[model samples]
Target chain A: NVLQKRPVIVKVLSTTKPFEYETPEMEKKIMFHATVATQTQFFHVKVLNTSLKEKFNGKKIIIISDYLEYDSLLEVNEESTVSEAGPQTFEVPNKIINRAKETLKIDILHKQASGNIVYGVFMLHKKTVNQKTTIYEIQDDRGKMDVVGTGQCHNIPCEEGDKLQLFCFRLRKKNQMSKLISEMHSFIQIK
Target chain B: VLQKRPVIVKVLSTTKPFEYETPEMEKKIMFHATVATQTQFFHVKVLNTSLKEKFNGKKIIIISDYLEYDSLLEVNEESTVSEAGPNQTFEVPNKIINRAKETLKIDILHKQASGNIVYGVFMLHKKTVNQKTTIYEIQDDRGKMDVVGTGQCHNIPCEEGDKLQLFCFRLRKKNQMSKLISEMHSFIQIK
Candidate 1:
């Protein structure tokens, strides 16, 4: 069957609902990222619906990206209406890497007084030879589990050609005596 | 220790009238089981009324052995009205099979029109040497992609004993033809 051979394409459609609360200026300024391979493309588009004639009368929808940019102006032709427009394609450079280029840094802060939940933060940095590191200090509290800590890292570093690939979060909780209660880990990847 | 007993009892409670529209006849029903002895009991009560007050007043009917068979009990004034009144136990032979006695059946039905979305229904039944069979049929014409057919099987079998199971559903839409649009599945299990 012809249906079996074709590559599938997914498209997202939107209406005034997403922009109902925003002003015209705010709506036109929002940007979205389109990723191709390891490259990133940024673009902004004005969405128009022919049914809302008064609100979008003489507006033009524009898409700006790294490779190309274009605009489509709405016309008053009653018979011709743009019901759906999109998934406009753009050319992106292809540079493949054999190894992962991103590093996930999970800094587990001190435990709270109640020790019910642990608090921490994480960062993802592109791979670079010269990365700066900062010291983190945990303060002793009035109680067994009460404490505070600070940490810092510089340039979060990456080289000119390296890209940030993936990152994640890992949470772990322990009792005041350091006995493990629970530990969980989840990841988020960006290409 | 009593904790080492092989049999475990589990209780589930439900409220009725199940629908919000009828509040006058609201009551609470409890279904309790003693797995080791293969015993089941049902307790029914008028909301906010104690068992003693009710027996001296209104009438209450309790149903037991719901699926395999049925046994009903009626209580009124002059009834024992003891603390153990609601704990009446009944036996259901061969009903409490071990985990090795049951299995899950998921039969994927044939695909039909409606353009692209495939429609199917599945059943889960307990298995034994002599199991009952039920037939389900689908209707035709129903333009808009609806056509029904019947499928039958004998012995509706589950080989392994009983285990509480959970199920969930995920939906995806495809391109015009039967191309892959999106597919997702998620599940949670407890032991």
Candidate 2:
């Protein structure tokens, strides 16, 4: 029997004005959604014509990675764009923050063209988090871009028999604009 | 450091002829040329759209594979297409015939479609073959209507101690309407 292959779909969210985080922090945020099956484990996310200094070296760009068990989130600074292909590397982290609710959190930050910052978070796994458990973040720089910050932990000892989970979150501040984006994903690996 | 990727190029050749001996049968052959690289591994050799056939519960198409290195040649018939789309499905072969020298000598028998048959040869490495290694021949319900042919080879295994060299050739076919289109990529794996 022949199995039909499905094409990946991308949904764009409403664009909102940059949020004001403080007396001098302000940034905008846009949202997008994508669904990826386990069968199609990889995806390449791209944001075109991004001009934020904290974003790609100030030009149009693409981001590539494998799919999360749930969803993947990205945050871009709505301020100045980088003049060159800025940071080209990023990390997908797996580390839940709470064990009772099985929640993990990953944060990313980037500098914008206006000398501000851009960042976001993603939910990697859904359930496995403990006081001493280690989390792992995956990163890559196949293209030309600046990578400002990255962190990951692995082989964290768990106290329960539940699956491993992680969450993603991000925030950006530029030209008095500040915004945040968050997501969640879950996976289980018994070792 | 930034590294440039190699490009895949397919060059067509003039028509030529070939001969084949299959058990109690003998036939003439011809083909075209295409090349591939590691980045671009899949090449499409479009066969005329009229030779596809449906028999019993099977859909079949034929292809030629030329193992120029091993001096071996083969013809293959497959049941499905690796390429899939919204409203179209393609059928491909499992094995291919390889040939040395300057020609391809084989024929493919498959179901016929009302539309034109477009077959292709995919490559996975950066190497070239003689023009006769790939062939395109179409047989319709009204007998042989169009005959076009081309050739391609995948990864070329060469020894580090051997002298580096390059090769080229042309094709010969009886079908005046037939000609080589373009060479494409297949796949290359280092075992």
Candidate 3:
């Protein structure tokens, strides 16, 4: 059965060098947020930002499946809004997304024409953020999807004594080759 | 609207080198084959001589999209004949292959597996192999993928002429960072 869930706080980095000395500089980089909520086999990444004017051409954002090299852009089938300007979005047909034991990597390549630069902000889909399981699940060597790790820390490029909290996940594995399969690393930076 | 299509092909390498040929003894390691008739996003790989056992836990196949990380297994679900014994094959998916572009890269990796050593063979699918138009797709950054000219090649110790071919798609940048997305360098063989 597929489990639907949302992105929770993972491990945050603290003991790294400060990104900037001033308060505003540090806030700009760490403030924008995104999340990957998962249910059973499906997952989605929602970007959350409001004041940023980064131009996100609807074409360049692509989702990557971790185990595989191939990626596809999230096709915008319906109108979904992340800011007052309008919802810049896309979607991948269920024919491809609804597979078992796959991980998705979301890539947003900013595309600008002439002077207008498009940026995007997305929030974690509520249903995805609320679920209490790993968003990107992989089949263990035995071909079963199970919880690997939760609330782990990701080392973000931060300033010293910044005190940011990040949740982390641990993937399961065995032996040397198996270790390659079970390794999972990601992070959500807290401002 | 311009639709990007993916193609797959089954290519047979002309020469298969021995497992223990030291870098000194190794001479030009290369594969020459034609694009199979029924082509789309193809996954190709080299396998061990064992018929019953699977290589890298059934993760031997490589493709253009997933060249950076480990390639997915060419499973029975996609292969035309699942029962075949010890022959290398390239299985293309229907989605990307059907589009018909020419000159694509089938990136591969050579890593240590269970009790034996394995070499990855990526099949080439040229949609416009014999076409008139030059297809311009985006090539990966200088060293973005996991196992390109970088990685163990610097340390693994291969022969001078041991040459490896990575699947790569070249894209032309308009400016230093931006430009019209077009295809550039078609195929590059590692020296």
Candidate 4:
């Protein structure tokens, strides 16, 4: 009989905190995404299990079974099982681990891929307080960047030193410049 | 109806006015002035710079009859200008429009667009965020697009190949993969 293929051996470089969503049938579920790596390649994985949400961290080599993968994004669903194999034998630089955290440093954000989870405290570098589509000039500890969104991003009103966070945003870079955009899941909050 | 407002603004700096050609081969003069209100600063694209003498040494200036488009102010024949008091009383900002090397955008569904609903399958980057927002690469008979949403979009688990009706969404043309962000009134339906 032919032997079954082994599960993909990967090291969990980093993982965002599990978040919840509602099903069409109205059931609540939990999931998380992680930056993962093998001996040579690195990619993003979305873990879609309610129980495994608390399992994967940044320091373990995981044997991922029954995952769904296309392009560089992978999915670990209900049928999938990620088992701890051994101590972390590989190295994923802070550059990689930093990309997985919800709160990312400005410098590290530049290296992250689009649709990556981004969060942090960046001061309003400067806007019409109520413009429909407001472009904010933001500066954090590392440096400054620009963001544009709707309705004052929940609470930060286009004034200096205003603080806010993006729940789901998109990072787009072009020849014109780099831009963090609002996506379907994107929202803003002020405090 | 076309309208205008009288505003008191300080020019942050002087610019070299230049000439360009119009469709009728008429010579057109243009220069950009970074103008500031007490609270906001914006680039004013000044055309027909007969007022260059007014902006010579003094920075604080008053203007009337202008048009705004894409957040930039423009003036042509419908304009008037005069010099204001010296720059001593005001500390106008340097630049906010071009402040960051990067930018941000909010991609909203076109309020005028038809076909707000699409039947699609979760095709890539399936993940959840903010305990309320869900994201996915959705595909239909045509192609793939990023589909993200909150509230009603949550808990709607897909069988992957099982297509759902993405209702009340919009399409944006971006170099990168963009998304159909849901609104408070939008929803997803398993059809």
**Model 4: how far residue B140 lies from native, Å:** 35
Per TM-score, the best of the predicted structures is: 4
RMSD of 4: 17.3
lDDT of 4 by residue, B54-171 (tens): 6664656777787765345666667877666655356544454244212221211211122222222233434455577777555532245566766556656765655455433444
Candidate 2 chain B: 10-residue stretch with minimal lDDT: B105-114
Off by over 4 Å in 3: A1-144, A149-167, A175-191, B1-22, B26-29, B32-93, B96-191
TM-score of the B chain in each candidate versus the native B chain = 0.19, 0.19, 0.24, 0.46
Question: Candidate 4: misplaced stretches above 4 Å?
Answer: A1-20, A33-45, A61-74, A79-86, A90-191, B1-3, B23-27, B86-88, B93-191
lDDT of 2 by residue, A68-173 (tens): 2211223222321223323452222222111112211211122111221122223223223334343333222211121112222233333333333222323334
- CAPRI tier of model 1: incorrect
After best superposition, candidate 2 residue B52: deviation in angstroms?
18
Predicted candidate 4 versus true structure: per-residue lDDT over A27-129, tens digit per residue: 6666665667765566677676857755587337778877776533676788787787766466666544544443655644553444444445566767544
Top of the candidates by lDDT: 4
| DockQ of predicted model 1 | 0.01
